[PDB]
Design a protein around this ligand. Structure first.
Ligand SMILES: [Mg+2]
Ligand SMILES: [Mg+2]
Ligand SMILES: [Mg+2]
Ligand SMILES: [Mg+2]
Lengths: 179, 179, 178, 178
């Protein structure tokens, strides 16, 4: 009970989610055997997926994070964001995998990809657990995706609403009476 | 294989670790039913423990992080650190739980506790998965602890060495030939 | 011109210049022999920090703080989130917080308490402008420039929607702009 | 005194003051009618930013960048980690990067490429000092103050282990200190 009471629907179940994270983990492990793999996730939304995915990757990898913010209304038209916390690991010549919790319009993601490319990684690929194909507003290639979902107000496994529901073990839709 | 090959000993096993995280989760859930719970962890070491613990807490909680750095040699004598990434959630009047991956000397922890107290949380408690009683150099009260361990160079479940081994599902000791 | 938005000048460029020189002399005498570190809060303190540090004939270091608001905590007890911490280790050092203006003094009291926790040998405050009738905190100002009425002032670092920081004098903004 | 550590003065306080005025006039003419945002890199650009912004009779905004080194990437291709991003939205704005000194120009070229990605209407560079014989990057400087030899200079923002930033002139440090 408690948070699970506010959930109106369960798009992806706990076990359903676990199996996919494990699956993606095997694919990544194989495509990156030999290669300097560095996982970069954007706080805070990606902590849940980052934690599970890295454990599902039997490889010597590094983890780092990025905290960004909005320039008001230039972020929504161009996806331009302010870097609050830059990553500390030097990614030049390394294989970087961007870990996202969800990709919808993809504006901010396309922008971060470009910014990260300017630091010369040997390669840069993107991985998401959630993805809203409808939503797409920018040309971004997701190299690893988890599930495709309808544009509903979802939460859980990192995703939130007013900082809440990040700890739900599944992906559910909040009752429209809460938002 | 791969990273598990560099491990010379396994102090806490995968399942051993999982059960304890679950245990602490039940205790926290009960002590905080009713109360505005906010979990603050210090990057990057605490991401692994944060992720598992919050899922093991059936409560409406908020998560936030802190990124700190060293002032050189004032950090080792006083535990004074520079705030690279401050927390965004306003903790005044809220119940804050500090989530650490490991507590050894406790200097930096005692300092962060004091700094966080200046922001007036309704309460401030500390939780760790790992703890080296020997190590203690400051007076810090750990309200929730996981395991007590000997002062050996350990890694895994968040803890690292040159940014590596954070993704190990267990707590092991690295072979002295690597450090 | 940026200057045409002013209702009246309160302090001329020459007044500021002279007051800054005066404060510089005092600080030079008082800190002779000490390990002085000047810390200003961005972005307001920029002009004053620049002129003041140049008027102090001592081997000082300079650093900066960038802070933000939490919302309620900030307005009530002056609690702020730090966006940019100072890099210099102020332990055992004689620190001087340089501010552009102190009115309520809430945020300042919080920052002083915060820096004290880092063990400076001493900590004092320096402001170029001051609005006494607006205090809300029991803060002590060790070096003060001018005391001014509670008017909407801009110039010499003080802004309004980011504008007017570059005026070489302190003036009152015309009400048709706020 | 801080001044006793100098081997020779290169540019006097009056030279700087006059050069700053001159640059201010040029920028005022060139940016009349535009949306000017000045961005300096902390902490070196502080003195120059202060004097320059005051010498420009235009409605400008001011912001700052705080950067750090990655290690190899920084030294090789001038790539830096940002510790403090600018807060003002520079999209569709006429931005002017204000620097204290450009020698190799590596880090500057990287920051210019980085700010271009944020879509300013225009982006230019302004430095008070310049060491041409030390270039390592194909960077274009739109407004320059003085060209100087490859000497260890301090003052007017330039430091050495955090000291000497407060000298009102540019001088060469005595070798018995490095
Ligand atoms: Mg995201
Ligand atoms: Mg820790
Ligand atoms: Mg101020
Ligand atoms: Mg510079």
């Amino acid at each position: 009970p408690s948070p699970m009471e506010d959930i109106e629907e369960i798009l992806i179940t706990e076990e359903q989610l676990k199996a996919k994270v494990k699956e993606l983990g095997e694919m990544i492990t194989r495509d990156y055997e030999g290669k300097d793999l560095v996982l970069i996730g954007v706080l805070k939304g990606a902590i849940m997926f980052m934690s599970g995915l890295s454990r599902a990757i039997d490889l010597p990898l590094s983890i780092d994070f990025l905290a960004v913010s909005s320039y008001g209304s230039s972020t929504k038209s161009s996806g331009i964001v302010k870097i609050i916390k830059d990553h500390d690991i030097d990614i030049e010549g390394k294989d970087v995998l961007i870990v996202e919790d969800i990709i919808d319009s993809g504006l901010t993601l396309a922008y971060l990809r470009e910014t990260l490319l300017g630091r010369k990684p040997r390669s840069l690929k993107i991985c998401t657990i959630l993805d809203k194909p409808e939503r797409r507003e920018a040309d971004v290639k997701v190299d690893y995706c988890g599930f495709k979902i309808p544009d509903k107000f979802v939460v859980g496994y990192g995703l939130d609403y007013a900082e809440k529901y990040r700890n739900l073990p599944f992906i559910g839709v909040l009752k429209p009476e809460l938002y």
